[PDB]
Every structure is written in C-alpha cells, then in structure tokens.
Design a protein around this ligand. Structure first.
Ligand code: EUJ
Ligand code: EUJ
Lengths: 509, 509
C-alpha cells in the first residue's frame, strides 16, 4: 500500500499546523485572519514547496495498445488475459499526449480529489448544520425580505454577470486573443449563475464574536444559506438547456420547460425533506425513545441520511432537500428529544461541519495541483472582477429600496454597505467549477473563480474590522401580524392551531 | 448514478428496523436478543428475500478480448482507444467462466464490500473506543492475570485447534471426500490463530445492565480487548511463514525469524502509539487550548488518526497501535482536557463505535451474497465445533489453576464457568476470513467460521441469563504492592514520581 496513507498524513499535518497557528493568532488577539484563510495559505505553501522540490526526474509514458474493432470506451469491461477474466474500470480519459513528457516530470503525488466528493460527503454535512443551527428568534420578522433577496438578487446578479462577460468576450473577439465561436451566451449565463453563491463564513464568525446587531446577522445568514441552493438549482437548470436544432439559439421554446423543470425540482426536494422531517417527528413523538439517547440519536442520523439518499436517488437535488429537512427537524423534532440527545446531535453535527469546511478550504488552497490550468488573459480576470462588484452593487440597493417602500416599520439603512462588503465566495462556486473539466472555456472560468476567491476571501477577512469600525455599526449588543403581509401571522396561527398539538407538546422529553 | 444510493438506502432501512425492533423488545423486557443478533437476523432475512425474488432473468456474459503480447495483468493500465488514453484499473479477477451463466442469473445487486473496509475504516473506531473506555478502577489488581490469559491462552487454543483440525483432515483423507495434498499444517495453524479472537459484546452489555461483580467484567473485557490484537498479529506472522525450499516443511529455521518479526511488530506498534499519546499530552499541557473546545477536540481526533496512519504506513499493524494510543491517551490526556471536551470526545467516539459495530454485524448477517460459498462437508463443521469447545476448555482451567497457585489473595473460583460460556466470535475472525478468497480451503474456513458465529452468537445470547441465574452469580452490586509481584507497585511509584508532575497536574483544565 502506502499511497493514501501519505496524503492523509500530509492533510492531518497541515490541519494540525493550521489549528496551532490559529490558536497562536487568537492568543495575541491579532485577528485579521480566519482559520479558513490559514488553511488556504498553508495549502498554497504546501503546493509551492511540493511542485519545486523534485522537479528533475524521469519521463513516464503510458503504453499504447491498438484495440481493433473498438469504436467506444465503456466505463466497465472484462478483459481476457491468460484465459482469465479481469474487471477493468475506465477511470479517466487523457487527451494530453503532447504534454505527456511534461506531465511525467515533477509528477510527485497527484493528491487529486474526485469532483463528486465535494457533493455527496462534504457539502451535505455543512448544509445540514447550517439548517439545524437556526436561532428561532427573529428570522421571521425579516423572512420575507430574506426571501426576496435570495430569490430575485441571485437571478439579477447572474443576468448582469452573464451580459457583462458576453460583452467582454465580444471585445476579446475584436482583440483576437483566441478563436471566436467557442464561447456562447449559455456559457456566460452558466458562469453568472455559478458566481452567485456567497459564503461569508469569516464575516459571520467575526459577527458572532463581536456580538453585532442580530438583525444584520440574521439577514446575512439567511441570504448566504438560501442563495447557495438557489444558485445550485439554477446552474443545473442552465446546464439542462439544450436546443434540438440551431445550438446556442435564443428563445428556442425551451425557456418554459427549463423553468418548469427548475420549479418541479425545487418543489420535489422541499416535499421530500418535509416528509422525512414529519416522519421522524411522528416516530419520536409516538414512541417512548427518550430513555435511550443512543437509539434516538442513531435513528435521527439515519433518517437524515436516508432523506438525503432518497432525494438523490429520485433524480432531484439532495442539498436543498437536506437543508429543508434540517430546518424542519430543528423546528419540530428538537422539542421532543431528551435533554441529552439535543446536545449530542448539536455537538456532533457542528464538529462534522467544522471538519468538513476545514478540509474543503485546505483542499481549495491547493492551486498548483491542477496541471491543465489556464491562468492567463488578464482582460478576462479584470472583466470578472468588475462584473462581480457591479452585480453585488445592483443586487442590494434596488431591492433594498423596493423593500423599504413597503417596509415593516424597520428601515435597514446603513446596513447595505456591510452587505456590499460581505461578498465572499465559498465552496459552492469552487465545486461547481471543478465539476466540469477538459474544456478550455471551463478551465478559464475555473481559474478565474479560483483567483477571485483567493483575492476576495483574504482581502475581506483582513478588512472586515476596519470596515465595521468605519460604519459606526453597533457592537457588543446582548442577544437576550398585519405588518408581516398578514400571511405569516396566518401561517403561525395555523401552526399553533393544528400541527403543534399533534406533532409535539406531548410525550416525555 | 443510482447504484450506491439504493444499497445505502437499504442499509439505512435495515438499521432503522433493527433499532425499532430492539426498542420494542426492550420495552417489554423480553431480552433474549441483542441489537447485534437483530441486525444479523435482519441481514439474513433481507438476503433470503433478495436471492429468491427475481431469480429468473437473462444471462449476461462478458466480452472476450485476445490481448496478444500480454503475459501479465497489471493493476493500472493506459489503453489507446480512438487515439485517446483511457486509464483502466484492474479491480478483480474472475476465474468462474464455467459458472458464469449461473452468475448472470439472479444477479440483482452485488452489495459486496471491499475486504479492507473492515480494516481501515470500521475496526479502528471500535478499537479506539474500547481502549479509551477504561474504568481506571480495578483492572490493575488483575492486570497480570489478564496478561497471562490473553497471551498464553491464545497460543494454546491456536495450537490445539490446529492439531485437531489437522487430525480431522487426515481422517478425511481416509474418507476421501476430496483430493489429499491441498491442505497443510500451515493452513490449520492459520485457522487456529484466526478462531481465537473473542468479542462477547452481548455478554458485556448484559453484565453492564445487570450490574454484575466488577472483577469478572474487568477480566472478560481485558481478555476480549487484548486477544483480538494478539490473534491479529499472530495470524499475520503465520501468513509470513514461507520456507525457501520444501514448502510446508517443519522447523525450517524460520521459526526464530517469525518470532522476531512478531516481537518487532508488537514493540514498534506500542512505541508509536505511546509516542503519539505523549506528544498530544504534552501539546495539551503546554498550551492553553482549554478555552476553545472545538480546537482541542479537532487536535485530539486528528492526532489519533495521524497515529493510526503513521503506524499503518511504517509497515506495522495499526489496530494494536490505535489500542495502545487510546489507552495511553485515556490515562494521561483525559486529566488535562476541559470539562466539555471530555464529554464531546467520549460521546462522539461511543456513537462512532455503536454505528460501526451495527454496520459490521448487519453486513455479517448477509450470508447469501457470496456466490463462491462452500457450505458442505459436515465433518469439517463438526470438527471445528468440537475444536473450539475443547480449546476454550483447555484455555481457562489450566491457566486459572496456575494463577491460583500464586494467587493475589483473591481466588476466582466459580467464575471460570462464565468464561467458558462466553465464547462468542466477533468481527476480527470474520474480517480475517474474508481477507483471503479465491481458494477452496480458504472458502471452507470462511464458511465454517460464518456458520460458527451464526450459531454461537444467537445461542449464547439466548442462554446468557439462565446460565447466570444457574451459577448463583451475584448481581445488582453497586460499583461505588508486594501481592502484585512488587513490579506493578514500582511502576505506579515511578509514574507518580516523575511522569505525572510533567505530563499533567498543571494547567487550566
Ligand atoms: C443529511 C445527513 C447528514 C449529512 C450526511 C452525513 C453522512 C456523511 O457525511 O458521511 C457519510 C459517510 C460515508 O458515506 P459517503 O462518503 O457519502 O458514500 C459515498 C457514496 O457511496 C458515493 O456514491 P454516490 O453518492 O451515490 O455517488 C461513492 O461514490 C463514494 O465512494 P468514494 O468515497 O470512494 O468516492 C462513497 O464514499 O458515512 C458515514 O459516515 C456513516 C456510515 C459509515 C459506515 C457505512 C459505510 C458504508
Ligand atoms: C484512531 C482514530 C479513530 C479511528 C479512525 C477515525 C477515522 C474514521 O474512522 O473515519 C475515517 C474517514 C474516512 O477515511 P477512510 O475511509 O478510512 O479512508 C480510506 C483510506 O484512504 C483507504 O486507503 P488505505 O487505508 O491506505 O488502504 C482507501 O482505500 C479508502 O477508499 P474506499 O472507502 O473507497 O475503499 C478510504 O475510504 O475520515 C473521516 O471521517 C474524517 C475525514 C473526512 C474528510 C476527509 C476525507 C479525505
């Protein structure tokens, strides 16, 4: 063996060093850096010292076999060698024979990760922890505004970024950096939808540490949680778009079917999550499992995982279903578990989320491991840099004014600048970029997104505190009907009238 | 996709049903069955209803390719298809072309697991939980007796089982069930070493529930923890045995080198575990990480995993190293962590152990998934049945009398019958049997071990309570120097003199 052990030990060493440096920084109260940034810089340093360590080496070239009567490449095959059947699995396709001698040199360790690892084992824990960790205080007086933000602003920013990137591509055509025709408006819309998920983890951590006003914290948290799933489903729907004839056409009667597919996927995921949540709530309520914390904790975890797996197997998106199942569980089941099971579940899920996010950011810090990188054409980077800023500018202020028109007697003025500053890009955009490879435009967007994350995360983590002090934002604040469109009051009355007495309020806690 | 999702959902459903039935049984206090037995019977039922559901189907035969100039089958290869390099990984070798049409029928879902999964991800959590969960009360007055038991009795039982199985094979040669010459004394010794690890999880659970005398509980726990690692290393050393000439020779000057390899492996694993434990203890003591439970918990978990990975990568055995690291950590570091981190680590590790053992037993309950089963030749099964009983008989009473000669003023008489009754076989024997396949003798021992586990676990789980009542064993007992060879007193004085003031006793807890 001794292949996975080395990389796992390297990851453990990097994580331990990151934790030690974070403790050292927090002991002196230097701040100006989060554990995510430390993991990123440690990954970058590790990659830099690994690439330029044993570069002079031998050149390894794979064997070439002329397999006649084979016009297709199946994933699975059975090869007859020495009259014996051997199961051969197609792993990946390599079309870089020209650069193969360069790939042989400085090979070291590939240390690559499967692109679905960020989807089936890494993201769902973080998403479920975010959904479960709901304050249940506030977040209802501003639920409507959060909804309009996370829904309309995502599409607005996607459209703006797509249009600006299409304009920059058209300008490049005049500049003639490369061939014209490869790029399309569909790719620009894909990039715009991808560059719309915001995960200001460092900003939220600073807000929690400094005890900022809970309204801004709740707004930012709700937006950052919802827009991730919104952008994921929107990106999937955009990738679904494929006209039968005249590729990259405009209004080919598939807009309606794409919208229908998006709505159906969202509704199905929400329904599955809610159904599983009420199923486990009823199971906990009817039974008397409060005397065995291990059994109920295992049932809770297994039911959550089964909800995720059933959402994935049905053809829908498991991330949004996990989010909705988690929020519904925290709403209903949390009032039925024993006093010990609540602590067990909360601590376990928060530890899993911490470990997953640290591993994600540490792997994201590795930028030298991708051999087919396309970090060039600085005009593209400048265009993306301007596009993200202008999209964030047009996202907040118009919608903020529209909400302030019919404001719920609580005008949120001077807080829009904080939302402007908080524009970090999390793991969702990186995973969506790494999902698709072996394509020059796709590699271009992946490299630009990596550079944008590398810049913006560090710069805003450094500048959060001075920006907070300059805006005179209140700090140190202790946490301890008709205005809400009259619909949320009716929903609350319906919840407290029928669902509460049956799903909870009875049974030994 | 939709391949792993189905099997994962099936596993989740089976586990949920097992937990529900366990709660139903415990509500009425019927007992007579543990969660492990429930998982086993549910797996057996699932396999039975899956095998005989859609048996009539089509016959699938793999393609045959005449790859000339290929006298070897590498694990990795690069195939040139359509002038493109495809990475093909050799997964498994199939030499069952004669039964291939039968394999095509009733294929359903393979649901198989990689044999190393029981080794690198499943066992280490259980082993670390067992090592960490040390009472620290008693277990020292009887440490010497536990050592002599787990060391001498394992080898004695292995030798007895090997000799008896060799005699039964020789009798079969006269009976002529199959060809003579395939079996060897090395295989008999391998089987004897494999059938020596005892994991009486149900007996220990019943003892904990009924509050039995702590002396017998501590003795059984220590024996069951130590003999597993002892048998693992002994089996590896036996598999190492390979004479240069005259295969299956007797006393080929390799006995000394095998003993040296065994001793070196044990010493290296113990040294690695202890070194990592003192490293993390010193790190916790010197720093002031008591104010951040998440950071210290992550450091603890990462250091334990790194200890396991470094033990595995060095060429030694990671299970015994994990065990020793866990016991040393529970001895030293547990007195330095904050009051919250202790609860976090304990609860997380016990939950991981519970989930891992439940999954292990549920997978063990699947006996119809292995197509190349050799459940026949009932004389072999009868021989193994007699051999395990006589080995357990000769394991306890002679060593018990020898210990009672120089007894530490505490004669353990009438408790030997309880140790005789507790003779369950856990996951270690099953994993060691499943490690090696594609061999008629190996399949024979695997099938016999599976049958032995299936019988003994259920029968002893059923009969534990009447056997306890018949022996008049005290129940309901509340837990709350020179005699110890004078060496353990010196060790305790040395620990309390030098190591304790430096490794602990200082720093904010
Ligand atoms: C919503 C609930 C909370 C979020 C989810 C929490 C669960 C969580 O994050 O960890 C999942 C892990 C591992 O489970 P997980 O890693 O997610 O399982 C992966 C899937 O089977 C995936 O298939 P698809 O997803 O269908 O494409 C496969 O390709 C991966 O193989 P690869 O890694 O070699 O690439 C598997 O690793 O499983 C446990 O830890 C408990 C069971 C361990 C013992 C049984 C093992 C079979
Ligand atoms: C002593 C300490 C306590 C006992 C050990 C506790 C740790 C524990 O049991 O789970 C281990 C899991 C998974 O880690 P784990 O499953 O053990 O990792 C396996 C090894 O890499 C194995 O290689 P070798 O062992 O060298 O042969 C490989 O073949 C398996 O691939 P396969 O599954 O497709 O067959 C991997 O799954 O990792 C975490 O849960 C935290 C990190 C997750 C995020 C990073 C993922 C890279």
């Amino acid at each position: 063996q001794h292949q996975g052990a080395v990389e796992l030990l390297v990851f453990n060493f990097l994580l331990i060093l990151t934790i030690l440096t974070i403790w050292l920084f927090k002991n002196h109260r230097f701040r100006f850096l989060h554990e995510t940034g430390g993991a990123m810089v440690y990954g970058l340093i590790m990659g830099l010292i690994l690439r330029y360590a044993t570069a002079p080496t031998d050149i390894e070239s794979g064997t070439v076999y002329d397999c006649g009567k084979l016009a297709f490449s199946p994933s699975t095959l059975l090869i007859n060698i020495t009259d014996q059947v051997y199961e051969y699995k197609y792993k990946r396709e390599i079309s870089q024979h020209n650069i193969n001698p360069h790939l042989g040199n400085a090979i070291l360790e590939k240390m690559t990760f499967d692109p679905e690892i960020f989807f089936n084992v890494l993201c769902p824990p973080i998403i479920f922890h975010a959904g479960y960790s709901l304050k249940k205080r506030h977040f209802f007086q501003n639920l409507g505004s959060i909804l309009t933000y996370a829904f309309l602003g995502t599409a607005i920013s996607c459209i703006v970024i797509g249009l600006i990137m299409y304009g920059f591509v058209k300008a490049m055509v005049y500049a003639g950096q490369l061939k014209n025709g490869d790029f399309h408006f569909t790719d620009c819309l894909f990039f715009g939808s991808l560059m719309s998920a915001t995960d200001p983890v460092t900003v939220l951590a600073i807000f929690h540490e400094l005890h900022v006003d809970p309204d801004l914290y709740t707004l930012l948290f709700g937006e950052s949680v919802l827009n991730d799933a919104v952008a994921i489903v929107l990106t999937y729907s955009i990738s679904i778009y494929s006209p039968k004839e005249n590729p990259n056409a405009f209004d080919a009667a598939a807009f309606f079917q794409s919208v229908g597919n998006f709505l159906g996927i969202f509704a199905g995921s929400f329904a599955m999550g809610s159904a599983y949540a009420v199923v486990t709530a009823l199971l906990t309520k009817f039974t008397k499992l409060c005397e065995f914390p291990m059994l109920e904790t295992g049932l809770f975890f297994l039911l959550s995982w089964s909800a995720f797996l059933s959402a994935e197997a049905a053809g829908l998106t498991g991330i949004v279903a996990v989010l909705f199942c988690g929020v519904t569980q925290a709403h209903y089941t949390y009032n039925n578990l024993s006093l010990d099971s609540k602590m067990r579940t909360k601590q376990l899920f928060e530890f899993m989320n911490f470990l997953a996010e640290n591993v994600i950011f540490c792997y994201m810090g590795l930028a030298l491991f991708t051999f087919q990188n396309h970090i060039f054409n600085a005009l593209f980077i400048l265009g993306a840099f301007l596009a993200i800023f202008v999209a964030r500018a047009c996202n907040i202020y118009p919608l903020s004014f529209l909400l302030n028109l019919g404001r719920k007697h609580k005008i949120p003025w001077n807080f829009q600048h904080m939302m402007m500053f908080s524009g970090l890009r999390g793991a969702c955009a990186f995973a969506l970029a790494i999902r698709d490879t072996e394509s020059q435009p796709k590699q271009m967007m992946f490299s630009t997104t990596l550079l944008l994350v590398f810049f913006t995360v560090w710069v805003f983590g450094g500048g959060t505190t001075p920006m907070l002090t300059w805006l005179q934002i209140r700090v140190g604040v202790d946490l301890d009907k008709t205005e809400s469109a009259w619909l949320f009051r009716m929903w609350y009355g319906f919840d407290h009238k029928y669902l509460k007495p049956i799903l909870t309020h009875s049974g030994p806690p």
